């Protein structure tokens, strides 16, 4: 495949909890994507996998709707449990049980199932996957991007979507491909302290890092 590099451009902030806060500045320490970091761009025209390190961050600008899955795990071929989804116009059902995957995918508990609206609704698909204390957390948010060149400017907070009850230790992950091309951005989370700004409607409109440059430390 093809590997390139991109700056983050202050994107990847989310709601830290499920409490409504309005017109306040809140300082939270959590696994966040640091501002102006190195995000690896992957073009999948050709597939070895990627290491999982304290959660990841996925971005996609694919208008053609050819991304229909995320695969997690440790060894990726049976044994330990590997997440697998099916995305179409009908269901978003979750498969945790083993299948004995191949090299190019184009006996435990926690067999989650979920029938709901499709995840994939000039569009930006953002995702955050993290794992703390056996709890697996998913975050997602649509973004109607107009200037389709790179990761755009602004602050789009990510809605918390799915929390799993329990999971196995995860060190590796893959990405599905659709054939009858694909490009995704991968970033890595780090434990950081953020200062989030809430407007009168309770939405996160701005955020200041506390470890980027000394002006931001002074603002924190």
């Amino acid at each position: 495949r093809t590997q390139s590099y991109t700056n983050s451009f202050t994107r990847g902030v989310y709601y830290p909890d499920k409490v409504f806060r309005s017109s306040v500045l809140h300082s939270t320490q959590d696994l966040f994507l640091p501002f102006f970091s190195n995000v690896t761009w992957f073009h999948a025209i050709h597939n070895p996998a990627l290491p999982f390190n304290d959660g990841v961050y996925f971005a996609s600008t694919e208008k053609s709707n050819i991304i229909r899955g995320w695969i997690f795990g440790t060894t990726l071929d049976s044994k330990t449990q590997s997440l697998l989804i099916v995305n179409n116009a009908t269901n978003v059902v979750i498969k945790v049980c083993e299948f004995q995957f191949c090299n190019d995918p184009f006996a435990n508990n926690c067999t989650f199932e979920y029938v709901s609206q499709p995840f994939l609704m000039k569009n930006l698909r953002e995702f955050v996957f993290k794992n703390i204390d056996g709890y697996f957390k998913i975050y997602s948010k649509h973004t109607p991007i107009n200037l389709e060149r790179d990761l755009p400017q602004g602050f789009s907070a990510l809605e918390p979507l799915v929390d799993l009850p329990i999971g196995i230790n995860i060190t590796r992950f893959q990405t599905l491909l659709a054939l009858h091309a694909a490009a995704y951005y991968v970033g890595y989370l780090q434990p950081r302290t953020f200062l989030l700004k809430y407007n009168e409607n309770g939405t996160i409109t701005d955020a200041v890092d506390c470890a980027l440059d000394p002006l931001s430390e002074t603002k924190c």
Binding site: K18, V19, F20, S22, D133, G134, D163, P165, I168, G202
Partner: protein, 364 residues
């Protein structure tokens, strides 16, 4: 409040007034099913330590008074909550973890402990809010030839994350020479059997352990204990029990744009400002009931026993009434004169004990 039988001429701040609540409201989500503690606490066998079984208890009504009848244990030892208060408040989800350990190793099932179970078999988080139950199984899990159906793991390369399960069966190597699948020199099996016998001492008897882990209210609550609901009323000073949150205040219909994943709204001083009703999806605003300090304006007890009451900083429709800028004055008559200040009250208003029958008057 002055600890004296005579007071002097002046204004004294005595206490505060507060409208008492008149009704009690308990709002719980509508739910019919009962939680199956009988399957957890009464089973023909329990899983091993290295492969502990977790059951997700949700969408039911949890009664904790039947746990004592199900199993003959001594102490319902908890860490974040109290055993007697578990039928009042309620949680989001319950997780029951069941295993059988040795009697010498029951003290390792606690937050912030090390050892052998707490390092390689079953590790609890430091912020653990839940209860641990252990009871004897000498008549169910002990054989005179040795019970060999229970295994524990003691050899591992690293520590264990909290609530991490490991069922891998690989031959442990503690040297440079590889085992290559043969348990030869410096090659060990990480799983060993307990070998329970009834002739052992009381410290080596098998104890069945069930760990009930609760998680706090951050989602819509779907498992709750038995409490009767009450019809909701608004614009009244009431006591409320919203999913275990007990408080006093008035509930108002509010236009707050709650996101669909959010359930609560907090203030600057970490006080709950807005709630979501559990039965119907409505947003309610909590405001504390009407209050204010009370000042007593009097001359000396040597002069008279008459007093005037200043209600501080209230437009007093919620108690001679005179509305000043520093509250309202009851018991003093306003006059259209101007004397020097005798007893100061507020923004340009002074009170004095004058004839013009003697009475307490207020003026500018």
């Amino acid at each position: 409040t002055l600890k004296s039988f005579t007071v002097e001429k002046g204004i004294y701040q005595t206490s505060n007034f507060r409208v008492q609540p008149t009704e009690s409201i308990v709002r719980f989500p509508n739910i019919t099913n009962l939680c199956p503690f009988h399957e957890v606490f009464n089973a023909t066998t329990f899983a091993s330590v290295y492969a502990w079984n977790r059951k997700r208890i949700s969408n039911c009504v949890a009664d904790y008074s039947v746990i004592y009848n199900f199993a003959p244990f001594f102490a319902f030892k908890c860490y974040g909550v109290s055993p007697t208060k578990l039928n009042d408040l309620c949680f989001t989800n319950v997780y029951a973890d069941s295993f059988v350990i040795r009697g010498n190793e029951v003290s390792q099932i606690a937050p912030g402990q090390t050892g052998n179970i707490a390092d390689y078999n079953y590790k609890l988080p430091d912020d653990f809010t839940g209860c641990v139950i252990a009871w004897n199984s000498n008549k169910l899990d002990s054989k005179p030839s040795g019970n060999y159906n229970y295994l524990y793991r003691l050899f591992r390369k690293s520590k264990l994350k909290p609530f991490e399960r490991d069922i891998s069966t690989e031959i442990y190597q503690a040297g440079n020479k590889p085992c290559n699948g043969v348990a030869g020199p410096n090659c060990y099996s990480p799983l060993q059997s307990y070998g329970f016998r009834p002739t052992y001492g009381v410290g080596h008897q098998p104890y069945r352990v069930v760990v009930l882990s609760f998680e706090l209210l951050h989602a819509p609550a779907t498992v709750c204990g038995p409490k009767k609901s009450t019809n909701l009323v608004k614009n009244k000073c009431v006591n409320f029990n919203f999913n275990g949150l007990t408080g006093t205040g008035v509930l108002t219909e509010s236009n707050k744009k709650f996101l669909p994943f959010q359930q609560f709204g907090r203030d600057i001083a970490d006080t709950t400002d807005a709630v979501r009703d559990p039965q119907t999806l409505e947003i309610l605003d909590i405001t504390p009931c009407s209050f204010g300090g009370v000042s007593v304006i009097t001359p000396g007890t040597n002069t008279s026993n008459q007093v005037a009451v200043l209600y501080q900083g209230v437009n007093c429709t919620e108690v001679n009434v005179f509305q000043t800028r520093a509250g309202c004055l009851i018991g003093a008559e306003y006059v259209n004169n101007s004397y020097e200040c005798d007893i100061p009250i507020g923004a340009g208003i002074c009170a004095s004990y004058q004839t013009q029958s003697q009475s307490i008057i207020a003026y500018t």
